[PDB]
Design an enzyme around this catalytic site. Structure first.
Site, PDB file in Angstrom:
ATOM      1  N   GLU A  81      16.090  51.166 -13.157  1.00 31.50           N
ATOM      2  CA  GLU A  81      15.462  51.898 -14.236  1.00 31.50           C
ATOM      3  C   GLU A  81      15.953  51.408 -15.809  1.00 31.50           C
ATOM      4  OE1 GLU A  81      13.169  54.217 -14.241  1.00 31.50           O
ATOM      5  OE2 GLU A  81      12.948  54.138 -11.960  1.00 31.50           O
ATOM      6  N   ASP A 115      -0.559  62.996 -10.925  1.00 36.71           N
ATOM      7  CA  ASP A 115       0.794  63.093 -11.449  1.00 36.71           C
ATOM      8  C   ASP A 115       1.065  64.773 -11.460  1.00 36.71           C
ATOM      9  OD1 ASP A 115       1.731  60.729 -10.974  1.00 36.71           O
ATOM     10  OD2 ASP A 115       1.956  60.476 -13.183  1.00 36.71           O
ATOM     11  N   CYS A 159       7.042  54.195   1.275  1.00 33.20           N
ATOM     12  CA  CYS A 159       6.168  53.993   2.352  1.00 33.20           C
ATOM     13  C   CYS A 159       5.828  52.815   3.096  1.00 33.20           C
ATOM     14  CB  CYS A 159       4.962  54.679   1.766  1.00 33.20           C
ATOM     15  SG  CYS A 159       3.960  53.621   0.295  1.00 33.20           S
TER      16      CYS A 159
HETATM   17  N1  LIG Z   1      14.013  56.419 -11.016  1.00 36.28           N
HETATM   18  C1  LIG Z   1      13.571  57.618 -10.327  1.00 36.28           C
HETATM   19  N2  LIG Z   1      14.506  58.829 -10.474  1.00 36.28           N
HETATM   20  C2  LIG Z   1      14.259  59.992  -9.702  1.00 36.28           C
HETATM   21  N3  LIG Z   1      12.959  60.151  -8.970  1.00 36.28           N
HETATM   22  C3  LIG Z   1      11.898  59.273  -8.963  1.00 36.28           C
HETATM   23  C4  LIG Z   1      12.303  57.890  -9.822  1.00 36.28           C
HETATM   24  N4  LIG Z   1      11.353  57.136  -9.527  1.00 36.28           N
HETATM   25  C5  LIG Z   1      10.283  57.948  -8.756  1.00 36.28           C
HETATM   26  N5  LIG Z   1      10.732  59.037  -8.602  1.00 36.28           N
HETATM   27  C6  LIG Z   1      10.017  60.190  -7.750  1.00 36.28           C
HETATM   28  O1  LIG Z   1       9.262  59.844  -6.783  1.00 36.28           O
HETATM   29  C7  LIG Z   1       7.922  60.192  -6.861  1.00 36.28           C
HETATM   30  C8  LIG Z   1       6.896  59.159  -6.572  1.00 36.28           C
HETATM   31  O2  LIG Z   1       7.193  57.925  -7.063  1.00 36.28           O
HETATM   32  S1  LIG Z   1       6.159  56.662  -7.539  1.00 36.28           S
HETATM   33  O3  LIG Z   1       6.618  55.713  -7.979  1.00 36.28           O
HETATM   34  O4  LIG Z   1       5.220  57.502  -8.348  1.00 36.28           O
HETATM   35  N6  LIG Z   1       5.011  56.407  -6.509  1.00 36.28           N
HETATM   36  C9  LIG Z   1       5.512  55.991  -4.947  1.00 36.28           C
HETATM   37  O5  LIG Z   1       6.575  55.316  -4.998  1.00 36.28           O
HETATM   38  C10 LIG Z   1       4.565  56.468  -4.147  1.00 36.28           C
HETATM   39  N7  LIG Z   1       4.806  55.384  -3.002  1.00 36.28           N
HETATM   40  C11 LIG Z   1       5.010  57.772  -3.387  1.00 36.28           C
HETATM   41  O6  LIG Z   1       6.226  57.857  -3.368  1.00 36.28           O
HETATM   42  C12 LIG Z   1       7.987  60.420  -8.611  1.00 36.28           C
HETATM   43  O7  LIG Z   1       6.816  61.328  -8.683  1.00 36.28           O
HETATM   44  C13 LIG Z   1       9.260  60.892  -8.694  1.00 36.28           C
HETATM   45  O8  LIG Z   1       9.165  62.292  -8.292  1.00 36.28           O
HETATM   46 ZN   LIG Z   2       3.695  55.999  -1.086  1.00 31.33          ZN
END
Ligand SMILES: Nc1ncnc2c1ncn2[C@@H]1O[C@H](COS(=O)(=O)NC(=O)[C@@H](N)CO)[C@@H](O)[C@H]1O
Ligand SMILES: [Zn+2]
Ligand SMILES: Nc1ncnc2c1ncn2[C@@H]1O[C@H](COS(=O)(=O)NC(=O)[C@@H](N)CO)[C@@H](O)[C@H]1O
Ligand SMILES: [Cl-]
Ligand SMILES: [Cl-]
Ligand SMILES: [Zn+2]
Lengths: 477, 493
Positions: A313, A391, A281
């Protein structure tokens, strides 16, 4: 012990009549104390040497330019000491404008190194704030349930990634935590995207945009990520030049040895300009940065699905539930506080319908640590109760009856953080808020296939209708 | 060119047993026999390798070997080693290669090259090589390297028309990017040659994408895949990009560790200064693992790497539209016709030579319908330098007349009556390069070929909007039907 904060400055910039100024400057000019007589006081003294001291109130570099006014009828710095109270000792740390750091039988003794330009720019203020924040800290993520669906029977118990690899749905990519999706797994990803588009984004009146995927420091400075996102970033460096002559050595080295000289390449690339899409974003916000929105233009309701996000990660072999390269639909909305909260609830209603009626999965919602606080080094909960992250979690049967549920997407109210950070105003002048929702397609796939299996004959009628005829994979001998 | 003979000259000695004196005569017999039978194998009449002199010593069976193009001295010495060990540690004194060349070359830092001097007919290379290097075929790769640099030093890009559309009336003459900025379609992103597409511009991209799926990929039986976007050195070594793609890649470096203590110094620096310490960060990141997606197709080939395809599984017809490509292009402030971050539909097909040629024909036919009937643009196509060669630093064509790239070019009326046309997509036949590079085989043992096609969405937009304008009332009916009702942009004060 209750040690006191102490500012100590040594500085220098014909007259005897200055006795009616300096003697009374310690009781009139610099006597501005908040709780009591807390001004700058007792010490000894065009080289006019000053050794005056202070505490938090009437700082020694705020009082030194006050003497610049009175004596007018550049400031060179000699010695600077800050005695900071601390209940216990702290590890050695390198911080700009700090020359010495020492933990004692009293607290922390800092020896800062500033000029007059540095004093004007408020340098000792931020150092104090940071050091105090490290001593204040001298624990864990927040979680509480909001709603969970009634338990279901789980006839499929296998790891969906293993099931996918065995059945030729996907394969491992070359890079760390990276996957290549064959026709079957790709069909699943595009069906989830079609659902989010048709069942959520279109009926709610969201408009597609294309957000940049290479994110610069400028963006992450404005979004706050520049405060602590570093451990998880995939950094991007351009070459220092495009001149082929400059790269010939690398090319020639490879052609002879069949090994790419990664160490020499590292010397030949520029410092990083930023990194790959992490939160998705933030780069959108350059579209609205410095702008003022007319009130008829809000709520601004927008989404992106134009590329990959990259996060370094934790180590280990994982399935598609935890990857270094992923595919997300970023949903962003902007408006008044009331509209932002209303937009969030609209999404919750559409997500409920999707997960109950189309995917028919077992899932739950929980309040957690705001995504933005976690991604810049903080934990706990936001200061405002309407601000935070919800969440979405689902069970993965293969993980056992006590296994951890997988976060598969979130919905967030961000408050005024982004509008403030990127300087986005409303015409009426009322405060702008924003939210965002991240849909992780790898995560949707881990959840759906862990619960429902890889066999179209066992999937809900509503999903199977939307899939069409499943494609065939690419078979090998 | 130079008619001078490619020749190899090796001065060396063996040690294939415990140290004797002059205590065997069969050494003289087998060197004479090898010249007549052994060292002739794999060489045309009289073009075999030759041992031209030999002498003994304390565990030294030293010889001077000579050869040309075939049975090279670094190959022949292991033929002799197997003989002098089964009938009864190679150390190199000198390794000389004479290579024909018209022009003199600027000497550069190349590993395993001690000396380089001009001779009559070409260039002489003295190599700094041991027995491991010879076995590795290091002399072969030095020769291939030098032959490439000699070929380049001769008398740029190739171009020949294949088909052009009859000129059209061009009523719109604005720079489409300027027009798009003024009307609120898009804005510049923070990164070099980067763009943020508002609802209007994004609608255009999505409509192009839908045209490709419905008018090309679906009727031709293509299957969507998702290719990786971060590309590793491993992928580019197999694709050949490791040979010279460097000047134009956006390099990716992971952190050396996730340990927050390691990154504390960086965060602390920013919190105190409000500046990102990019010099310190560079010290803290790992060496680059590769770079951002450049050609798009290469990382797909890891899916088929080292596998054998059943004959009923070909042609393999796949596509990808899952993200961004990044190239460090030439500097300057440009519109969407010249960007560092772009969006492409990569179309890939694999099969026999004839199947690959056919798939290329089928795409060309579908593309012709799209541009003539739906976009209704003025365009042309031309045979050009193969894309894979250009991205390795090479020019010219492939020697297999069917291997190469066809570029699609369209005029941008704002560039004037003599302005350069814009390449907006290509179709390529790549031969056996990728199957060989990644080790993909066919069950029947017949050769595997592939091709690819790259649809650049920014380029389609630059071309379509330069010719048609931004007003839907002036767009072709067939395009207007597919776009639907155009959305509103985001209006600012
Ligand atoms: N390493 C990852 N692998 C796969 N999916 C991921 C990973 N990190 C985040 N996501 C997905 O992206 C979603 C939102 O990511 S978040 O870190 O929680 N929050 C954000 O980045 C916010 N800006 C909304 O995107 C998570 O709910 C998950 O579904
Ligand atoms: Zn976002
Ligand atoms: N810098 C760029 N900006 C926008 N589009 C680009 C850029 N570079 C290439 N493209 C698009 O990508 C298409 C194919 O790119 S290519 O370099 O010619 N060849 C390849 O990389 C092949 N692998 C085909 O994808 C081009 O026809 C063009 O439409
Ligand atoms: Cl980001
Ligand atoms: Cl690539
Ligand atoms: Zn390609």
């Amino acid at each position: 012990s209750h040690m006191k904060l102490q500012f100590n400055l040594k500085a220098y910039f014909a007259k005897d009549a200055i006795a009616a100024l300096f003697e009374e400057a310690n009781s009139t000019l610099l006597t501005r104390g908040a709780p009591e007589g807390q001004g700058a006081k007792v010490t000894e003294w065009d080289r006019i040497e000053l050794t005056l001291q202070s505490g938090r109130y009437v700082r020694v570099h705020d009082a030194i330019f006050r003497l610049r006014k009175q004596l007018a009828e550049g400031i060179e710095v000699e010695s600077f000491i800050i005695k900071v109270p601390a209940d216990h000792e702290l590890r050695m740390l390198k911080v700009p404008y700090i020359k010495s750091m020492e933990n004692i039988e009293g607290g922390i003794q800092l020896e800062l190194e500033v000029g007059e330009a540095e004093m004007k720019n408020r340098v000792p203020d931020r150092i104090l704030t940071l050091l105090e924040e490290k001593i204040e800290a001298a624990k864990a993520e927040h979680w509480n349930l909001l709603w969970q669906r009634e338990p279901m029977e789980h006839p499929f118990k296998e790891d969906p990634t293993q099931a996918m690899m065995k059945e030729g749905w996907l394969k491992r990519g070359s890079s760390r935590g990276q996957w290549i999706h064959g026709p079957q797994s790709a069909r699943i990803f595009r069906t989830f995207e079609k659902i989010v588009l048709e069942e959520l984004l279109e009926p709610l009146g969201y408009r597609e945009m294309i957000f940049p995927k290479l994110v610069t420091w400028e963006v992450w400075m404005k979004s706050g990520h520049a405060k602590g996102v570093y451990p998880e970033i995939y950094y991007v460096c351009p070459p220092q030049t495009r001149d082929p002559d400059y790269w010939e050595e690398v090319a020639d080295y490879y052609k002879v040895t069949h090994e790419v000289p990664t160490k020499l390449i590292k010397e030949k690339i520029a410092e990083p300009i930023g990194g790959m899409c992490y939160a998705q974003c933030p780069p959108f916000w350059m579209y609205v940065a410095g702008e003022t929105l007319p009130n008829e233009e809000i709520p601004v309701k927008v989404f992106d699905r134009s590329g990959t996000s990259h996060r370094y990660e934790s180590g280990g072999i994982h399935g598609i539930e935890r990857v270094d390269e992923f595919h997300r639909i970023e949903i962003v909305w902007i408006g008044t506080k009331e509209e932002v909260l209303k937009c969030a609830e609209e999404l919750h209603d559409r997500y409920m319908h999707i997960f109950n009626d189309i995917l028919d999965i077992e899932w739950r919602k929980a309040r957690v640590t705001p995504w933005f606080m976690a991604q810049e080094g903080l934990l706990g909960l936001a200061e405002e109760n309407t601000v935070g992250t919800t969440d979405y979690e689902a069970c993965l049967p293969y993980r056992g009856p006590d296994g951890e549920w997988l976060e598969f997407q979130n919905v967030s109210i961000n408050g005024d953080k982004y509008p403030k950070g990127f300087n986005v105003k409303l015409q009426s002048g009322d405060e702008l808020w924003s939210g965002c929702s991240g849909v992780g397609l790898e995560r949707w796939a881990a959840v759906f296939l862990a619960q429902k299996g890889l066999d179209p004959a066992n999937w809900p009628e509503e999903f199977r209708n939307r899939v069409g005829e499943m494609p065939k994979g690419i078979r090998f001998l």
